[PDB]
Amino acid sequence: ERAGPVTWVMMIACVVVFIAMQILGDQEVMLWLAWPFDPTLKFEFWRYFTHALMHFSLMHILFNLLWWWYLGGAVEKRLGSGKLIVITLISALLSGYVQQKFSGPWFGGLSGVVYALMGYVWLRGERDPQSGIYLQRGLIIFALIWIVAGWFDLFGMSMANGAHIAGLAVGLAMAFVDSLN
Numbered sequence: 001e002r003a004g005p006v007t008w009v010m011m012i013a014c015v016v017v018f019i020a021m022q023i024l025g026d027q028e029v030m031l032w033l034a035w036p037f038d039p040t041l042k043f044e045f046w047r048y049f050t051h052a053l054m055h056f057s058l059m060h061i062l063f064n065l066l067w068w069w070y071l072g073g074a075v076e077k078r079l080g081s082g083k084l085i086v087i088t089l090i091s092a093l094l095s096g097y098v099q100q101k102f103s104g105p106w107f108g109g110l111s112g113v114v115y116a117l118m119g120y121v122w123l124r125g126e127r128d129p130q131s132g133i134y135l136q137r138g139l140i141i142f143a144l145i146w147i148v149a150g151w152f153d154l155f156g157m158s159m160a161n162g163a164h165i166a167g168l169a170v171g172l173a174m175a176f177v178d179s180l181n
């Protein structure tokens with residue numbers, strides 16, 4: 001069993017963008033992919049999403065993609081590519097929105113999407129075991145350690161706590177809806 005198409009293409013894209021950032025510099029890439037940072041860019045619609053593709057350190061991309069691979073992979077395999085697409089688009093938009101509102105447009109990465117996937121997978125498993133989707137006890141512990149790392153600035157993730165809460169809320173809400181149905 002291997003990662004599905006959405007899980008795989010997201011990982012490829014983040015690596016390619018990370019390479020571009022090392023070659024050209026972070027700023028050069030942000031100029032093109034960042035959330036709109038000037039009114040002249042407000043209708044460059046890719047920017048409301050592409051911020052999620054940028055990472056700012058090895059640790060940032062490593063841990064984001066490990067969680068994405070594991071949690072996104074599981075969602076895609078058990079629940080379908082469509083499910084993963086929607087969790088990803090909604091969490092990237094809302095977490096990105098909240099991030100720019102409080103801290104400005106210069107940010108990036110998949111950490112908001114990961115918070116959504118953590119909340120989704122955990123809650124789905126706690127409310128609906130028969131779904132086949134759940135967050136293993138042991139992995140709950142390491143998810144919490146990753147969360148704490150970002151929460152208390154022990155580990156730089158680009159995004160702020162409120163933005164991460166927004167991502168988490170999306171995952172929890174979708175898991176809640178899916179557990180009812």
Ligand SMILES: CCCCCCCCCO[C@@H]1O[C@H](CO)[C@@H](O)[C@H](O)[C@H]1O
Nearest residue numbers: 001002003066067069070073074077142
């Ligand atoms: C602390 C970092 C978070 C924990 C990282 C655990 C990663 C486990 C990934 O396993 C892989 O998942 C793929 C997608 O589901 C499967 O296709 C594949 O068969 C399986 O080998």
Ligand SMILES: CCCCCCCCCO[C@@H]1O[C@H](CO)[C@@H](O)[C@H](O)[C@H]1O
Nearest residue numbers: 063066070074134135136137138139142
């Ligand atoms: C700093 C990184 C620490 C990561 C150390 C390895 C963690 C072990 C997790 O194993 C993974 O558990 C999943 C749930 O059972 C399986 O789906 C998957 O196949 C398996 O690979």
